[PDB]
A paper describes a structure:
However, a prerequisite for efficient transmission of avian viruses between humans is a change from preferential recognition by the [name] hemagglutinin (HA) of α2-3-sialyl-galactose-terminating host cell receptors, predominant in avian respiratory and gastrointestinal epithelia, to those terminating in α2-6-sialyl-galactose, which predominate in the human upper respiratory tract. Thus to better understand the nature and significance of such adaptive changes, it is essential to monitor HA changes that may affect receptor specificity of avian [name] viruses, particularly during human infection. A single amino acid difference was observed in the HA of each egg-grown [name]: Asp186Glu in A/Vietnam/CL1/2004, Val134Ala in A/Vietnam/CL105/2005, and Phe151Leu in A/Vietnam/CL2009C/2005 (H5 numbering). The effects of the single amino acid substitutions in the HA on receptor binding were also studied by X-ray crystallography of HAs in complex with pentasaccharides possessing terminal sialic acid (Sia) linked to galactose (Gal) by either α2-3 ([name]) or α2-6 (LSTc) linkage.
Introduction of a more bulky Val134 side-chain in the mutant, in place of the highly conserved Ala134 in wild type HA, increases the width of the hydrophobic channel between the 130- and 220-loops that form the front and left edges of the receptor-binding site. As a consequence, the H-bond between Gln222 and Ser132 is not formed in the mutant. The distances between Gln222 and the glycosidic-linkage O and between Gln222 and the 4-OH of Gal-2 are also slightly increased; as a consequence, the H-bonds formed between Gln222 and [name] are weaker and Gal-2 was not readily discernible. The crystallographic structure of the HA–receptor complexes provided an explanation for the poor receptor binding by the Ala134Val mutant HA, namely that distortion of the binding site by the bulkier valine residue would potentially cause a reduction in the strength of H-bonds between receptor and binding site. The consequent increased width of the site is more akin to that of human H3 (and H9) viruses with their preference for α2-6-sialyl receptors. In the Ala134Val mutant–LSTc complex, only Sia-1 was detected, suggesting slightly weaker binding of the human receptor analog (LSTc), than to the wild type HA. These observations are consistent with the comparative binding data obtained with the wild type H5 and the Glu186Asp and Ala134Val mutant recombinant viruses. Detailed analyses of the binding properties of the recombinant viruses containing the Ala134Val substitution, observed in [name] isolated from a fatal case of [name] infection after 4 days of illness, showed consistently that binding to α2-3-sialyl sequences was reduced, but with no detectable increase in binding to the repertoire of α2-6-sialyl sequences examined.
Numbering used by the authors:
A (entry chain E), C (entry chain E), F (entry chain E): 5 to 325
B (entry chain F), D (entry chain F), E (entry chain F): 1 to 158
């Protein structure tokens, strides 16, 4: 008669690593790294992202006519933009402090576009003629829908003194621009005056723009340049515009509704018609694991990102052969 | 392993003990069979469960990468940003992999230790009236019958 | 007869955590996290901080008349500034490269203010008239005490060509400014000339300022703007001033005496009449623990900051019930 | 715990042993009492003291946050600065908490091991001429008197 | 150390055992000498070798400082850059020193454990027919001759 | 008769540290920290560094006449520059976005200097007279060899309209400059015209420079200032130059050949005539250890840098005395 002490074995094939020994076969293990995703861009908690498609954040906000799909956008959970969007800045130029605007945008879930200066105003200056073939719409020469390229009337460009008060509760994103023609003759033709300026003022802003004339490479057949500026107009503040030419003027501005949690994610994917609690630029995650190795940049209730290919904890004991 | 029982003086585990991590195999005139030791198995379950929960919790405050953009003449800061984000991810990857490696070893050893302590508990009870075989088993000097076997398992023998 | 082996128990109630087990009661323990502070701002090793009270670093340095308490300040250990100081920049504007100056200041323990251009100079221009109601002192219209707002004399504003040599051993912080009036008429009234400039030069600096005229919101009833600049004048170097209007001119500058270890800490607390070897924005620490969890930003011989609520090491053994 | 002595085969500690961490309880015709084993207690004190000093020292080169300010149009760098400072603090918080957790376990186990080794030292001396009870105690075959007891404690028995 | 053999109940090592980490010393009428136990020595070599390779590998993804320059009015970012690079180096220095400290302890203990398990293996074989001296040695009741000695070493005794 | 179990001792003196115990003597140990270097600057994998010696990156690229040694440099592995190079910017001034250029350079292994605008051109303006005594060569007044300081011809400075096309495959680094004279009289003397500009344009660049006149400290006996700008001209793009004075003009530009792995290391050392696989600013490393403690900034197949003075792993066991 005999009694023995012993321990469990099973048919487990699960393996774990230790400092002194790799691939130890154990009776039980818990994998803690999520390695799978669904390859789609999804709603986050019921809330659809803003998918820019072929538009840039600049093209969207300025109202590139190629970006009509985004004329009026509902609340988003996050924004998706391609690495190299074709529809950006149809008329060549720069967008001043663009990255600081992108950054500001990553902490915004809703815009509400309101008109601040009507096109059917500017009795002194021509508003319907500021159009280029580089910004086409339906085969016709058009232009950024949210700003008005003002041209002389009857060969006159009288000094402009216009202003807008922010009656709204909400902070207002306001965009304007300046045109840099490429020679002395273009200046007179667009604007009678030879030496011009645009001055912009609020309580914090003390701006004076001056067009920089020079010959430059044709970009999409154009030698002129646009340069766009923006400010955040605090509620109850007023913006003062003064110019005698080259003024690309606000028609519409954006009310900042939401101030939600957000990011601009870079992805080539399109909408996937799904819902998730955790989104990556490569696909969504549905997991209760504490780690994942999909992509560093996520949004939602997400596991922690590591670069491992494998994270498996022993729970059971060394399985005997 | 460190405590010498698992795959040491006890040569391998039991496919036939299905209801616990550690237990007993008895063999006498009436027959033979396996009985899980419920108390030590349960102690082990708690320890291992707590460990997994401790590991998860300590790691729920890792670094979260944030999208951040820069122009053509902000290269130095862009690169700074990149090396910073990657720096953290490398630290946390290392932290996670190492904790798993080290704790995996502690878990294997803990099991080994639980088995050795269970073995010693029985050796201390049996004392003289059994022959210590050297392989996990004790061979009784006296006939031992199911209720005798039971008293070894329940810790009330002799 | 019997001998037994055993181990100590006691009435200890101290508890420690392990990976596999929380709240193990142990016979002895050593707590290593300092959790207490005294809630006061104190001298560091005998040396009083500079407590700005309601003044900003800008208000202090420019000499806002509301900041007279800081006319002449002794060596400090560190500087304390509120989150939103009321007495900053009494006449609206900006302070150029302000944060880079704040940063420079965090590595300075002593200033010594010397006069570099006397008010009782400027025979050509009016010095006693550059005063505003937005910067009051004793009910009267006053202005930043360290700079002189120069105005025309007898409707004349002759070109200014003034310079100062740094004879001192010590680096010199020099501050000047430019006034941005809000229309053409204010320009002539303050300064006869229509188109003006301020040019500043040292061995490294090649500056030319030009006033930006424009209409802007009234801030504290004012539409003008001041914009202040600074430089660090190396010893034996000279600063060259040239202007025909809008020049806000140096009267006093700061000698950089000390170059000590320091910070600008943000705190709403006032002076506490105490001494410490370790100061936080929330209170001082007196501890021999290696860690604390009070605030990240400390000065002095301090424990290391962690976010834990609890750090307790076992020294003794598992206390039996 | 791992070594099976503390709150294992020795069921609980001694309120009455006041002068050391580990020791002996004797009981014979002349009376009964406690004696701390000074050598193992002192070894344990050194180990634990060194450990605390090692832990403090390794952690005296943690990251120190520095005040740093930014304007309205330097948001990206401000945020970078914030996530960097918080990133380090999270790493060091984790490092500190984990080291404490792991070393707390090593300390409990070390005590357990010191007790087991002291027990084995006496078992190895006593050998045959005492009955190993299974609870930390040895019951002598021969009468054992204070000087006999002393020789067990001082390691010079038989 | 934790397992009580090295510089514990076995008082010191053997200068004369040159061919292994653990082994046997025999002494009988025909003479005396040392024999390395090849199996446990080899197990130890693998473990230690793997450990060193694990340690090196986990540390091959440390932070790499990069040269980066700034002008007179970019002081804040310069300082940010400096505190970031130093921050990582401090983290990795700590990681390296701690891993070495902790694993050095695990290695010493592992050796101690290998010695104890080898000792128990022989104790379990010898059983009754030898006297356990308390110092690492067993003194035979019966005469033991080289081939007898060999059977203890090879695990096939009695 | 007796058999004993035991373990190895030896004459080892090697010591390791543990948490609970310092300086434990062990039978075997493996040191893992490289502590030695060779104190030299060496070729990396057969490829010689560019050692600037007493020249700065600016002096080299602009072609400071004191930097002739670097007229034509072969492929480098890395660049070495002293902390404070004497031969930088012989005529005082600034180099615009210098650090962003240095950064760009750290990802370049080979330049190939080509001529883009010949000196024997500029029929309208004087090219051979733009020379200063602050930039001497062989006792004579000279100037940066890669740019041409253009002066008036027959008291005439006609508007310049010059352009260059990048026919090459490779990106082209192009450098130009502007001169800031120190008074009205110097302007006329160098350039007839009183109010001048330099305008530069490519597809991305929209520049207009204007000379800032002012009195400033004599630096190396000079009160004028040069300010140098650069751009990266994409292949197939064209750069447009227009100026009526103060134009420091491109003669030579750099073809970007290699785009290799690199750094600018700061070192006072000179070339050591050796080869290595791992270089630090203080000397080269030849080691199979995984760590070293030499310097943080390395290039090549290098061990990981730590701040430790000692890293020694136990392999063997506690050596008995
Ligand atoms: C461990 O097993 C895996 C199989 O998934 C194999 O790829 C790997 O090479 C093995 N590693 C070692 C060192 O045995
Ligand atoms: C530069 O020259 C090439 C070669 O003819 C030409 O194709 C290219 O268009 C030129 N650049 C511009 C802006 O035209
Ligand atoms: C441990 O004890 C503390 C009492 O301070 C209690 O708040 C905590 O919930 C306990 N934790 C667990 C998991 O028992
Ligand atoms: C903007 O309009 C509101 C509404 O009347 C007014 O109270 C506010 O003062 C205006 N802003 C300024 C700068 O006056
Ligand atoms: C350990 O030994 C070294 C000799 O290299 C000595 O400098 C050091 O002080 C010793 N440390 C301790 C705490 O014994
Ligand atoms: C400043 O004054 C000192 C004292 O004479 C003089 O030596 C120095 O040259 C002056 N600075 C300049 C730029 O001349």
């Amino acid at each position: 008669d005999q009694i023995c002490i012993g321990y469990h074995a099973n048919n487990s094939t699960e393996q774990v690593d230790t400092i002194m020994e790799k691939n130890v076969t154990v009776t039980h293990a818990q994998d803690i790294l999520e390695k799978k995703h669904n390859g789609k861009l999804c709603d986050l908690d019921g809330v659809k992202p803003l998918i820019l498609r072929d538009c840039s954040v600049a093209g969207w906000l300025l109202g590139n006519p190629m970006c009509d799909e985004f004329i009026n956008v509902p609340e988003w959970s996050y924004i998706v933009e391609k690495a190299n969007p074709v529809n950006d800045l149809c008329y060549p130029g720069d967008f001043n402090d663009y990255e600081e605007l992108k950054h500001l945008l990553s902490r915004i879930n809703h815009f509400e576009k309101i008109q601040i200066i009507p096109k059917s105003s500017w009795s002194s200056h021509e508003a319907s003629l500021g159009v280029s073939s580089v910004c086409p719409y339906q085969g016709k020469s058009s232009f950024f829908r949210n700003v008005v390229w003002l041209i002389k009337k009857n060969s006159t460009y009288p000094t402009i003194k216009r202003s807008y008060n922010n009656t709204n509760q909400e902070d207002l994103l306001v965009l304007w621009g300046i045109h840099h023609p490429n020679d002395a003759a273009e200046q007179t033709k667009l604007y009678q005056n030879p030496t011009t300026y645009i001055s912009v003022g609020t309580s914090t802003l003390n701006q004076r723009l001056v067009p920089r004339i020079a010959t430059r490479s044709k970009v999409n057949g154009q030698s002129g340049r646009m340069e766009f500026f923006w400010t955040i107009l605090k509620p109850n503040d007023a913006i003062n515009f003064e110019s005698n030419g080259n003024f690309i003027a606000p028609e519409y501005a954006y009310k900042i509704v939401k101030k939600g949690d957000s990011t601009i994610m870079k992805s080539e994917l399109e909408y996937g018609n799904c819902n998730t609690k955790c989104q990556t630029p490569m696909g969504a995650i549905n997991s209760s694991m504490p780690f994942h190795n999909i992509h560093p940049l996520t949004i939602g209730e997400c596991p922690k990102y590591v670069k491992s290919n494998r994270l498996v904890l022993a729970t059971g004991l060394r399985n005997s052969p | 392993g460190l405590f010498g029982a698992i795959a040491g003086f006890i040569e391998g585990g039991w496919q036939g003990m299905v209801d616990g991590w550690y237990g007993y195999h008895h063999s006498n005139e009436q027959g033979s069979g396996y009985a899980a030791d419920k108390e030590s198995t349960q102690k082990a379950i708690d320890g291992v469960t707590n460990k997994v929960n401790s590991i998860i919790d300590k790691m729920n405050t890792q670094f979260e990468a944030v999208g951040r953009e820069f122009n053509n003449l902000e290269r130095r800061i862009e690169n700074l940003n990149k090396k910073m984000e990657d720096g953290f991810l490398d630290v946390w990857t290392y932290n996670a992999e190492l904790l798993v490696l080290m704790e995996n070893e502690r878990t294997l050893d803990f099991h080994d230790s639980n088995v050795k302590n269970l073995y010693d508990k029985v050796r201390l009870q049996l004392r003289d009236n059994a022959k210590e075989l050297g392989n996990g088993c004790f061979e009784f000097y006296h006939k031992c019958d199911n209720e005798c076997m039971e008293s070894v398992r329940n810790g009330t023998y002799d």
